[PDB]
Amino acid sequence: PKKRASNGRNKKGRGHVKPVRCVNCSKSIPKDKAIKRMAIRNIVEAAAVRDLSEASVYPEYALPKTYNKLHYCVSCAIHARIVRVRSREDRKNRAPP
Amino acid sequence: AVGKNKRLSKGKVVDPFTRKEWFDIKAPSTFENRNVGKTLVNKSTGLKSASDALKGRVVEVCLADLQGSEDHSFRKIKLRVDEVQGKNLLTNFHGMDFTTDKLRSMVRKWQTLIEANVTVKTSDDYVLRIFAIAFTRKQANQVKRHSYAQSSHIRAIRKVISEILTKEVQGSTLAQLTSKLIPEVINKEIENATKDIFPLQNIHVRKVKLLKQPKFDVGALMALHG
Amino acid sequence: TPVTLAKVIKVLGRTGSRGGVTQVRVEFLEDTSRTIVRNVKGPVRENDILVLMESEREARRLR
Amino acid sequence: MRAKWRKKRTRRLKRKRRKVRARSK
Amino acid sequence: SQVFGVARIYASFNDTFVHVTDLSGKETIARVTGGMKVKADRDESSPYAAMLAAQDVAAKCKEVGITAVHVKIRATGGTRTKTPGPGGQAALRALARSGLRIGRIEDVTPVPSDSTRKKGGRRGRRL
RNA sequence: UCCGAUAUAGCGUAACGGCUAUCACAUCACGCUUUCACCGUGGAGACCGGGGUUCGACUCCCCGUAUCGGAGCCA
RNA sequence: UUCCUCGUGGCCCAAUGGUCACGGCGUCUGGCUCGAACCAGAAGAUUCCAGGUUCAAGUCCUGGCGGGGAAGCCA
RNA sequence: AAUCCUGGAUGGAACGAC
RNA sequence: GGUGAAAUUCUUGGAUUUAUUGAAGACUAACUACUGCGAAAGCAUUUGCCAAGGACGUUUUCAUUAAUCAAGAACGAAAGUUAGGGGAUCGAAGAUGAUCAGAUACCGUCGUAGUCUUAACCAUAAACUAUGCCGACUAGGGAUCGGGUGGUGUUUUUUUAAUGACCCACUCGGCACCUUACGAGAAAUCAAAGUCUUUGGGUUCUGGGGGGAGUAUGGUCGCAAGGCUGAAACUUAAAGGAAUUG
């Protein structure tokens, strides 16, 4: 039976959405069914920053960051301990935590 | 990995750094600083004339390193070598560029991006492809969450920007244009010309590149380095 | 063949599929203010002392 | 068996019957 | 006072490259990979191996005359992961601890404008 | 007949006149894995044969055998 | 008919004149787990037959049995 | 009275029902 | 290098890597969304040209011309076919390295056809909202896209103006959405799947237990692959749907 209303995704009015490829499995998946996250992370870590500041000329420089939009497939997403699963009722919670 | 190699060679010591010498790199006069660093080459043997291998060398460096301020932090610059005179070799401008971190940080969703590009030439017969970028902004007093455009505003903006850059280039040779870039006055021209259409934050321009150089003309280059 | 002594300051938890291993964050005695995370084999408490045969390394934290 | 493959099988069979009947006709 | 080089750490999975150059990039120094310091084909990518490589090139640059360095961090990019490997940051920290000086870190991971094609098939790398 | 090269542990391979000699495979164990595999540590294992040079020959000189590849050929 | 070749544990296949003979599968016993798979282990040989050479023949030689291949043309 | 800051995961083999 | 681990492979002939150029062809990221357009498939760089189209506004015009549809006709993903062009990635087949009791399967490395384009065919699909089209009515709430109206509203200009972008209020049409059930339904669920035993607004297509079978045959279309149409004999008492507990 029908498990969801959007049926997996956010396609209402198109027919076609020009898919993408997963980063882990290289599987071809629509852009809307997919599961976009954004890994905006400081470059090195919260740890070695002290050594870097100590050893760096150009004090207070920036400690810049790394930005990338990651599309996972459903399979790899679950396997990676992400959106894992929810009960029949809290499926409908659309918001993040 | 260490002992994996079955064979070093299909069919079947000397240090190279004693063979080398250091060279001081000088930037033009459109910069508060000139001494950018150093470089390495081998000795000018009888058949090499190391200047030739050193001539087309390009170096990428930070505008903040060149101007002192960290306001010009991203703004990478590419400098081509064009002339040598006794270990203090000169350079000339070859191109600008942003940093990917800055670009990606500017890029956010629920705002519309705009990009323009022109292929204009100079008064000194240089040929540049200049790239411009802009982003919508959410006015204060605004409640609705995304602040997009209507795709005609965008075309008008692109037309405006293109004609602006063509104007501000024609009249500027190369270093005139460099001194126009550095203080980011073009950005102010853009915002003044476009505020009547749409808000447009983050009007930093983008990388710029050369396509065609004119003839060498030693004098124009030496005009910069005193 | 030098070493590096470090003092324990904070135990984090157990680790390893069989849980016979412990994560800890230490504080170097000499060159203090340096805090590195390591794995340990046997029983341990805070304020104990350990002997890094190499001080320049740390395991994947689990948190 | 999966209906896709059942159908494929039937198609190949029909090819064979077509040609063996064309041997005569 | 200082003299600068460029690091160009390429930290993929399956390996880690550290090879340091002059500001022009053409002239190189001390190219070393993680697999040159251990015998697995597995730990080629490991932080410890990258750390050892960084120690080695630190020694080489110091005996040459270099004191400062800029960092250009890179992953496989292209159609592939576009994220750095594990053995980048450890080596970074390692050459920092070795005695060198740092300036103007940056990532240059080659990102495309919707490139050709990513491999595996539309069904993916089943495993 | 000539030039050059090759013969090394059960297989294959590397070597400087200041060593009965290294390596991965093979085997004997020790390990580690639920087990299988994978993986790791210690061992036992060999300089084609023969003379010569040398404070010292795997290694250098001579000869011989076998193999390769190219030149050659008036009984 | 002639020539050439082969004959090895229940099957396939190997061997330097130098241990009543290498392997792989099969079989049997035990174990894990009910059976396969897997891990450990064992048993099984007059090397087709009859002669000879040799200190020593699975092999070296002759003869015999069987299998296989080639030739069996000119009119 | 001094005082700049952060979160992060890989993975082998495992037939059947008397 | 690639792997879970390895190997095939490339590697003193300099690989991998770094830098500078150059060529080719495909793609059009990040912006990119419970957003847009389109009859549907489907459509994303810029500029220019061509013609079209929906919505809104309208105290404009015609005057019932309309709705749905057998037959009939156009468009029709991908794969595929024919003939040229180009052929960089990826990659059915295939070749190989491993794993495995076996593995011509998953993994890895190569790799033709194809993937792109022009001319012509094919004419299907989970072509899915699995919900025919037209029309009316029936509960609330907000957000949003396009247009429109108003507001001494805010901001920007030349304090000022007109615009433009925001805010408030309202409205027409859209993609949709949250809550509720008065109702409906086998239930899941539904603002349409409601207004249907208190059974009838109009109209077209389709189904009558499961299998055999979308098979056979005959037609017709098609270069072919194949499509559309489409049985019976025989066989069986269960197949099946939604939900409950284990």
Residues ≥6 apart with Cβ < 8 Å to A65: A40, A41, A42, A43, B101, B105
Query: Could you say which nucleotides of strand H lie within 7 A of any protein CB atom?
Result: 4-11
What is the domain extent for residue A79?
1-97
Q: How far is the CA of E43 from the C1' of G40 (A)?
A: 35
| Contact criterion met (CB below 8 Å) for C46 and C5 | no
Detail the DSSP E strand segments found in chain B: 20-26, 35-42, 58-62, 76-83, 90-97, 113-118, 127-135, 208-212
Chain C residues touching chain E at CB-CB below 8 Å: 56-57
Question: In angstroms, what is the C-alpha Rg of chain D?
Answer: 11
| Contact criterion met (CB below 8 Å) for A89 and B126 | no
Angle formed by the axes of helices E89-98 and E47-64, to 10°?
40
Neighbours of B182 (CB within 10 A): 18
Q: What is the DSSP string of B94-118?
A: EEEE--HHHHHHH--SSS-EEEEEE
Question: Chains C, D in contact: 3+ Cβ pairs under 8 A?
Answer: no
Resolution (A): 3.2
Question: DSSP letter at A81?
Answer: T
Report d(CA C59, CA D9) in Å as an integer.
Answer: 56
Q: Name the residue among B38, B62, B101 with its Cβ closest to that of E107.
A: B101
Question: Chains B, D in contact: 3+ Cβ pairs under 8 A?
Answer: no
Q: Which of E2, E73, E118, E119 to mutate to test the interface with A (most CBs of A within 10 A)?
A: E118
Question: If you measure CA to CA, which chain E residue comes closest to C54?
Answer: E48
CATH among 2.40.50.140, 2.60.200.30, 3.20.20.70, 3.30.450.80 for C1-62: 2.40.50.140
Phi first, then psi, for residue A64 (nearest 5°) are -70, -175
Q: How far is the CA of A15 from the C1' of I219 (A)?
A: 38
Q: Is the CB of A81 under 7 A from strand I?
A: no
What are the domain boundaries of chain E? Answer: 1-127
Secondary structure element (H or E) that encloses residue E73, with its range: strand E68-74
Phi first, then psi, for residue C50 (nearest 5°) are -130, 165
**Of B197, B195, B185, B203, whose CA–CA distance to B114 is shortest?**
B203
The β-bridge relationship of strands B58-62 and B35-42 is: unpaired
Q: Which of E67, E107, E114, E117 to mutate to test the interface with A (most CBs of A within 10 A)?
A: E107
**Of A27, A25, A33, A23, whose CA–CA distance to A70 is shortest?**
A23
Phi first, then psi, for residue A44 (nearest 5°) are -95, -70
| Contact criterion met (CB below 8 Å) for B37 and B60 | no
Beta bridge partners of E32: E18
| Cβ within 8 Å, pair E2-A57 | yes
Here the CATH number for the domain that contains residue A74 is: 3.30.1740.20
E110 min Cα distance to partner chain B (Å)? 10
| Contact criterion met (CB below 8 Å) for A38 and A77 | no
Beta bridge partners of B58: B80
Neighboring chain E residues of C57 at a CB cutoff of 8 Å: 47-48, 51
Question: Chains C, E in contact: 3+ Cβ pairs under 8 A?
Answer: yes
Q: Is the CB of B3 under 7 A from strand F?
A: yes
State the greatest distance between any 2 C-alpha atoms of chain E, in Å, as a whole number. Answer: 57
Question: If you measure CA to CA, which chain C residue comes closest to E96?
Answer: C56
| Cβ within 8 Å, pair A26-E107 | no
CATH among 3.40.640.10, 3.40.50.720, 1.20.120.1690, 3.30.420.80 for E1-127: 3.30.420.80
- Where are the alpha helices (H) located in chain C, listed in sequence order? none
Phi first, then psi, for residue C13 (nearest 5°) are 170, 180
Report d(CA E94, CA E97) in Å as an integer.
Answer: 5
Instruction: State the Cα angle at E16 between E22 and B20, rounded to 5°.
Output: 25
Query: Could you say which nucleotides of strand I lie within 7 A of any protein CB atom?
Result: 1-7, 10-13, 15-21, 25-38, 40-48, 88-92, 106-109, 129-131, 143-147, 153-157, 162-168, 175-179, 187-190, 193, 214-217, 225-227, 241-243
| Cβ within 8 Å, pair A23-E68 | no
Report d(CA B96, CA B129) in Å as an integer.
Answer: 11
Report d(CA B106, CA B112) in Å as an integer.
Answer: 11
Question: DSSP letter at B195?
Answer: T
Neighboring chain A residues of E97 at a CB cutoff of 8 Å: 51, 55
Report d(CA C58, CA C54) in Å as an integer.
Answer: 10
**Chains with ≥3 Cβ pairs under 8 A against B?**
A, E
Neighbours of B37 (CB within 10 A): 21
Query: Of how many residues is chain D composed?
Result: 25
